[model samples]
Target: MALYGTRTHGLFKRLGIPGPTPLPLLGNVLSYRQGLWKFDTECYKKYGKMWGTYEGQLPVLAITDPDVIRTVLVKECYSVFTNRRSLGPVGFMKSAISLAEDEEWKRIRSLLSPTFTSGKLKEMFPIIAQYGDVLVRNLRREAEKGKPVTLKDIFGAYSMDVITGTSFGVNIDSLNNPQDPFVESTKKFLKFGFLDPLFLSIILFPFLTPVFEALNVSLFPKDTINFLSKSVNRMKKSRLNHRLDFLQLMIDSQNSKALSDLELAAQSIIFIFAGYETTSSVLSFTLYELATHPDVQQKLQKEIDAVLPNKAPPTYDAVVQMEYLDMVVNETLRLFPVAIRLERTCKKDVEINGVFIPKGSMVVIPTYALHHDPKYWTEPEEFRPERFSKKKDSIDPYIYTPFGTGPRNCIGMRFALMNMKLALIRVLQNFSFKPCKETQIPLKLDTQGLLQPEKPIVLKVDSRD
Candidate 1:
């Protein structure tokens, strides 16, 4: 039992955990929120590598210990932490990969694993490229409008359209149509608004969720759930050329009594949901950062020019070779990881760095915190694209876990990386982007939502020869 607030510290004393005593209901919310930009820096500077707290009655642990993070992710691993826990408490997410644990998670993970192999992504490559071109055309149209485009809106379209084309075996072009209900509804589920920190605190305290749930309330709109269900069902019935998208994979994985339509649909839902939003988040942040950093952008453009000069765009093999471009995307991921936090409940009690995390104690590794920790990164605030030298390979693996660690980690990582790199190649090849008057510098995050800019992020895209 850890207590965080001065008033709440008493609660920690009762619960047998450790945390600083702050105020009443405020607990550590101020530190958690304000410190999000540099989440773990201020804490690690003060609390060593690991800290624990009881916010009101909620037990919280902020961890940066690499070995411990490794143990939690791999050695003591289960699907619940990797998938089910990832969902937090989105209303319809419990049955989704975000909440399943133990045998169920293992079984489902096994069932879905092969769908994300490199070979499979190759088959899906043409579709991914096609959808990215759609995004490029949409951006070019916006550029022609001679206005700074809201990157968030553009990304929302990109994400929805790509996921729709790949997952549904159909083309639902939302890249040019942000108001498409599917896009609008799905966006709601992708992130929680400004109340993210509060919502997390509430999830840690179960009683808080029922209030939101009982309100017949949800983070995502009901219409979105219905739309996803209908879209997937409709796709399942359609006959088309052999497609190996994740949805098709899951549909094929369904066997006699092994999995039900509802269960399979849930898997497809999470896959598409995750694939769409997280991928877009990274791309949006990448564009925003590249727009702000011209030299890095120029370096990337040079690579694109050399490798893909007026060619028929890049193929999968060619895209993989753009090492500098890959690093740029990696840096962007470090800055704006789609999955902000990694959490686990103790499978067994273990002592780490002199702190005993008891069995069933909920533990969290704030990735945003680890990425910006000054101890791990030089000039942690600056965007040094070259910092990820080959020397970085020697750093503890958990220090850079945008896709997570261990076997239970994201299976779609390769596909996600490939899609992003290709998209950037297509866009950057024809345009030079920078922060214009409408764009914000040293941008703020919408800390409350899943992955979004704090406000509308606009950027100027100029045509390149």
Candidate 2:
């Protein structure tokens, strides 16, 4: 058996697995909580491939090797690692598909699978395109003022408008109305403050989630819960379009008694957050990369010009056909993946590649570590969109997943990609994104919940007149 760690953990040290030694009581909780990305990166660098860490007293295994990740996330053995590490205080989201466990997860996945299918997205394209137009107009207006614009906030508003329209059949026009309460509430929700006590407590002691819930402690703030609940309720009662929106699906599910009214409200809230927040982060980071890398920006612009010489908003097929644009987006996702790590909980004792993992262990696939691992790519830190080209064989798909993999991958993957493509095409065709004095070099990531920028992602916008 591999002898490691100052304190002998249960499964990992008992087996011959290598990992950092944990401190008594505190374990690796402080380091992991300080900065998850840095902590994992260091662990991978020190231990290589797979390593074991601790969350308070809990034994957690960090997996970065491509083969291990593929086996755990995609292979038939996936049934052994089906549920994700509990967020501890999900509140209403306890029923959301992303957080639902066991048979309930299977049921929700089966039911909601149709919502994001290609056929449904095709029907939803016009709704997304309308907001893309609004986005360009709003950006042009900001450019007219000749000031550096915060890409994250602008894209956040743009995505909020699109997601709200598509998901709830409401026209928030958040791009035009920056102070919209829904947008503000969502921004607050995604922003994680320093050493957030509640978040820290949950991460350290997830087993106490039931107790916290019983005491009525919630992950979402009071304002957020109220705003989302009221929004879903309004959509249910109002005479809206007969379009096949997410709200309609939830309403139908509610009518059929497939889900409770509370469940509907929870799902809708999660849909808004997942649907809008992550997509906006991707768009923001992509623009930041385009601004800093002039050559990449030029190549992408050329591709856009070739595909859409008339500079009109791209159709769904047209967006899909933008080869270079696809590469750029893919590369950006690699460098600044919003969901930096994919996590799961082992259902039973399992062994892979000769390593024994006990049941109830928390498994983490650190995407950030894998994407940046030099073994997988040459000059991994450099942003080269061509690395994703079909001719390139330097990387593996199993290691490059930004939307995750397996049955529990991002449900809104297709919709998020389509929305981002439309917005990028529309914006690129009208304006040239350039780095300004205010722009940050070697972007600093917020040491919080997802991979968000520590500072505003600012860029200079010049109209391509």
Candidate 3:
């Protein structure tokens, strides 16, 4: 698609952004569409952090300066960048927790916070642990039948089982039956709006979502919303007496006159949407990274062995004890963070690192570019897990932000880590993964859609024979 009208050639003089004219009719949309991920990398290297795009009427600043990005993310302009506005494609963020602002956002945050606390996630371990056991058993079953295990689907099932089990108390047998309707529904959601040109049009220009839907653009498959709403409502009713899950947190809050019905649904959907998808991507990438780097892979497995030591499955204590494993997870996130970019809109004019950014300018913290900046990282382009293990003084805290930073850091950080640690322990104990010839090297991250790999991540797996 083409971008809209262009602006002055003198833009390079005032604002320190790179790139040519926004392009006739399309603004920067053409260049952006060509190779979104790599285009910024080249631009940042040339322009050095703060740059501007003369695309369309307003000049969108492409900023990567740590101090500027910090102010935009944490300090002055915090509320300006709403995650709800950027969380996913159009359909995903219309009413999700990350989208809300002002008092409404606060109420939702408070209402949903309890469900992800250390105590709550701890209580929910057995539920998450169940999926770990199921995964190992299913892998073994497939191996015995001479059936090739689809690593992606298997891990996807593991995540689905854990997320649904915790949020809804549903013991979805994703491992037992990959064809299960619930799994099918989630598969559809995960795959939705990924590369569809129609989807992109609606996401980039959100007002077009409802319009496109009206004209049968099919922003999200009907089955996607059906499965989510049905699953949520079904979970609410079936587990009324046995509601020990995350839904209980929302319900209890609602009963105390603390929340409304829509708020309740939104909080429940928080874990179902943001929690499951990102954590699964983290796991898959960790596995892929480790597979290619065998020494790192072996070192991680050794750490797991030393920490776990024939334990039933990883407990909270055992999981945290694996320092190297934690480093690996951190490194994976640094490289292929599920949520690839961080953005904020400027509420007021602010000078950042000497550049004067006017009010209402969009602030973009290009995580992809920052993560690979050789100035901060020794081998920024290479996967080096040890870089994450530096002591507090040895590390520049601002250089790394996987869950982001400040008050807005991911609330489910602990929950995602806990479930992932448990799942990784089980997989390492029963099997060892090595990248198949099919696995993509120097992974191509997708910049078109919200959360995706630019290409298929086909990894190979082998049992510990």
Candidate 4:
């Protein structure tokens, strides 16, 4: 277990920083692969704010300090940490904004930014509301059956239906048609077995990415890419003439020239993967938290009742006006962020707190650790939405980055918030969520990819009387 002989051995010690002694060759790969979230939490507890871990042969500085995180994410020169850690074949084609670097990321981000603006989101609200109605109808039917309600399963379909309808302008109602082709393909593309070799290999030994790529390995299957490409083309021909959806916004962008036909298809795939899966996970965890905490649920319900007393469909203005609902969603994101780890590669040598980070060093922002840090948050384990309300102004801006921070933050932040709020309003108007026998106490975290329930999040649904 001695760190000697490894390429990155003594990296932290040389910088006068403290870190766990990584095993030779494996480095911290074994500890990280075992459980990413827990591994980060334990690292912070043992090594304090800033520490180093090796991703295969690459040395990564794991930064949990709010000031240091701000320095890396916002205050530092843009080039110092511009690009995300490359995921090999995943970033090879580089169509997705999340994986693109430098000029490419800037170009794609500029083209896609306007699509999620307040004005565009306002236009997208009714489409989201339409799907929200369908979600409520589906959930109510499940509630009436008196069986344990699996929140993630239903929310996944709901998220898919909303994203497809609003962004694609195609009303492929996955909630109604669970076995739809798009749904099946999406699940296939994103789903991973417990032993996903491609992903595990990339995580543990990223340097071998060229080998995998040389073997013609792709993160997505050929059929999956083809399916999305054909779907985008099909939707464009039929809907782009009149609909002001995300696809149309891209089409209308001044920098539309930056995207090729295949790249356009790639962006659409990224949108569905990020928008659909991440939002559903947020809704699932938020609903589970509300179900377990009756006090928080009742408070949030009262706020929903006040803004939408008539139980009318949620409007953009009304959804934005619900402050308590925002706090609840924010709290849930803090607990279970969709993008658990934020990474940036150093493009130039940078110094922070007397520690020098050389060019090419990877800087990691362990978002979950910062969010749950007792220094920044009181009773960090408890779900109190009011923490965001009262201490909203006083809290360190860097500690609560669920959607990330700065220009590279989630482009869909506003749209995703509107989607979640609209669904919450419609669902709460019809049903009351409570714990059931099938509900897991202190819900087990998935730890594989995004923060998801280890098992299905089953809850009881009572019709609001």
Candidate 5:
């Protein structure tokens, strides 16, 4: 296939950036043989921070240099670099804020923006606390079982419960049945395998995207999409008493701007999907880090001990004000950012600091590499929450972006943080995590999907009393 023939290797060479050599049609895909995260780190180390490589046939300029990263992700311009480089937009997710591009992204984002404002999230904090209580209860029983527990299995159910309760205005206690259909559906969604035929075909032949979209050949499981779609619509129909939640916000906006049912449905479904996986993965990793690093866990618990003195459920203010707790959360996000790489497509040819990025060329911020770069962090491999402490070091925000940066960053960032903080406060007040025999000293993570442990992240829970 001469489709991506001569153009592949020539561009990077002509540009004079160092990189792993590309194959005929495959590009530099095989460099991922070890793993995506490590490969990124290794390559950045081998060829300086800014280098050129290929994803399938697409030329990618991977940047870990802070100035260039800031330029691409934040400062240079959203006008010049607005949309993320995506495989293909699933038709079902057309109105989903994550896949929405340029003007539409701005429109939907503004519409959905106020829903996650501090006031709204504070109103929703009670539901988060309620679900976190359920999680703590379930965890007690799990601890009684006296075996290492899978962190994601517990956290995923809790995340689903919070998302359902807060977003859909429907109370679902997935924590009661961690093996429930909703949790299973979410797990299925995240397993976007690298080798799936449709996915492989799309990556290898980017031009086929429109054709596949026209044919309605979705790479995501139709069943899960349909299931979530029906669930959203069903939630809308069963609306009772206009609860102060995301669905209600959408309904309110529909009155303001005439959004159809499908628009609401699409936003609702994507919110659930977005709000589930990343938070759950972070929670799992955070607890795993705590379990393994008792010093940090104990320090964190001491902070929790001081904040909500009576162990009564934390008020929104109390949870948000825990400085050390925030530090732990920040460090965990740094170590295990689920959206490990942030990408943007150049809108026009532009040169910054003597490097030229042609219009349509993909620019990547190697987030994991940036986080773990020894230049920015000391003993980068170690789990140290103190790195985020106020007096410790004034780290560059552009270099340490867990929620991304600039105008096009994560929209539900505050809501996500609230979900994380409230859950930690509720759990650590009652129980503490400890590593068990099954715990992997250095976690084995899968390269194919989201940054998650290769096997179940098993940890032992000890009651505070």
Candidate 6:
């Protein structure tokens, strides 16, 4: 099996870094078969600040050292690290911005950046305000039932309304719809299916890259991808009108040059992928906190009452004034950062703080580990929004990167924040959440993909009255 010859055994010791030993062709990826978060946290504890693992056979450096993290994420970000790991995505997903490399990525990103700007977000505000109740409207019905409901399912409707409304200019209004295939289809779009045989097959044997590419095999469901691809093409001719949907925004870029249909569909699909699940999970996680921490929820309600007096949808003007709401959102992200770790593929060989990072090696900022590290955060497991009330400047940026830090961080940061605030204001105005028999008392988290409860967050809903 040539187990001793694996990179983790052969390279890490020489570099003065350490990690769990690797298997022959599999390397350390099998370690994740047990659970992703547990493996990540245990590796952090065992290896200390910096450690090495393997993505397929390629060496991956899981960096928690702030100085090296700073070097990787900020100081030398653009110069040495500009692309993400090549997952060998199939079909139109190949041209997606999250998966694109080098100049192509910059081209798409630069063109798309303006859509998320302040004025642009303001232009999209009324659209969000009009659709905010997609979450509340359903919650009110569930609240009256007096039985616990999964917050994620309800929050998902709101996320769908906002994402599809803002990016596609069409609304299924999944909140009330009993038979919308859109929500289920979109959920699969974000799930990279790390444990699926198709996904693992690519990692175990990299040579299959071209075979899968030739066959047009995507780790995600092909039916959904094709559905979106064909639908987007039709959308081009008879476009849905709106302030500025992402599909239209990208189509507008054709004025500069011919952007291929694959590129257009890929980027549009990725926008739907990125903008959907993360915010839905954020809303659910934040509500779980509010439901469990009554004192904190009480404090939050006070702010909502003062600023959201009219019980109207959230506006940019009012959202900014609510400092307590800001803290609560901040604290929730701290406890459960959307991603387990942030990844960047290196563009050139580099050294920072005595560590050598080779050109092709992957640099993974262990964001979840960093957020939960006791050295950076006291009682890291406890929920305390007051921690974010002040010392934001004092708290190291490298340590608190929910939206990530540096040039290639999430482009949807502002858009997500606005949608979150809008939903929070709207939901709290009409209904409040309470912990119930079904609530996860201490929180059981999942082992794969994003950081989320292993099961959906179930909470009792009460009308605010």
Task: Tell me how candidate 5 scores on lDDT.
Answer: 0.80
10 residues in a row with least lDDT, candidate 1 = 79-88
Residue pairs that clash (backbone atoms under 3 angstroms), model 5: none
In order, candidate lDDTs are 0.70, 0.80, 0.67, 0.79, 0.80, 0.80
Clashing pairs in 2: 2-16, 5-21
Model 5 — TM-score against the truth? 0.95
lDDT for 156 in candidate 3 is 73
Winner of 1 and 5 under TM-score: 5
Write candidate 4's Cα lDDT for 1-465 as tens digits.
454548676778898787777777767777865567788888889998688987666788988777788888887636577787865675334668877888777778877787888887887777778888788888988999988798887888888888877777777767667577787787764574233777667766777788877787777665666788788889777654566677877766624346676667778888887787788989999999999998888888898888888787677788878888989998999888767888888887788667888777788888888888888788999888888796556666677788889777888898888888888888888889999888999888876777778888899999996
For model 6, the superposed segments whose C-alpha errors exceed 4 Å read: 3-8, 240-243, 256-258, 391-393
- Model 5 error, position 263 (Å): 2.3
Per-residue C-alpha lDDT of model 3 across residues 261-295, encoded as one tens digit per residue: 55566556656666666777778888878878989
Q: Write the per-residue lDDT of candidate 1 for residues 1-465, one digit (tens) a residue.
A: 233335434533554544565555555656656535454556666776666765444556767778878767876665223432323335645556545767777777777777778888888888888877787888888988878788767776777777777776666777655677666667666644455654656644656666666665555556777788887777787744266576767766673336667777777777777777677778888988888888999998898888777745789888877888878987887777767777676656666555665554567777877887777878877887887767564556798888887876777798788777877888888788888877777788764445567777788888885
Ranked by TM-score, the better of candidates 1 and 4 is: 4
Question: For candidate 6, lDDT tens digit of each residue in 367-421?
Answer: 8888888888889999999888676546788888889888788888998988898
Q: What global local distance difference test value does model 1 have?
A: 0.70
TM-score of each: 0.87, 0.93, 0.87, 0.94, 0.95, 0.94
Model 1 segments more than 4 A misplaced: 1-18, 22-39, 78-92, 178-180, 190-204, 207-219, 239-241, 255-257, 391-393
Q: What's model 5's lDDT at 60?
A: 88
Candidate 3, superposed: residue stretches over 4 Å from native: 1-4, 7-16, 54-58, 77-93, 145-149, 193-195, 203-219, 239-242, 347-360, 391-394, 441-443, 450-455
Poorest 10 consecutive residues of model 3 by lDDT?
84-93
True-structure Cα RMSD, model 6 = 2.1
**C-alpha-based local distance difference test score of model 4:** 0.79
> Alpha-carbon error at 203 in model 2, in Å?
1.8
Model 4, position 232: C-alpha lDDT score: 83
TM-score of 3: 0.87
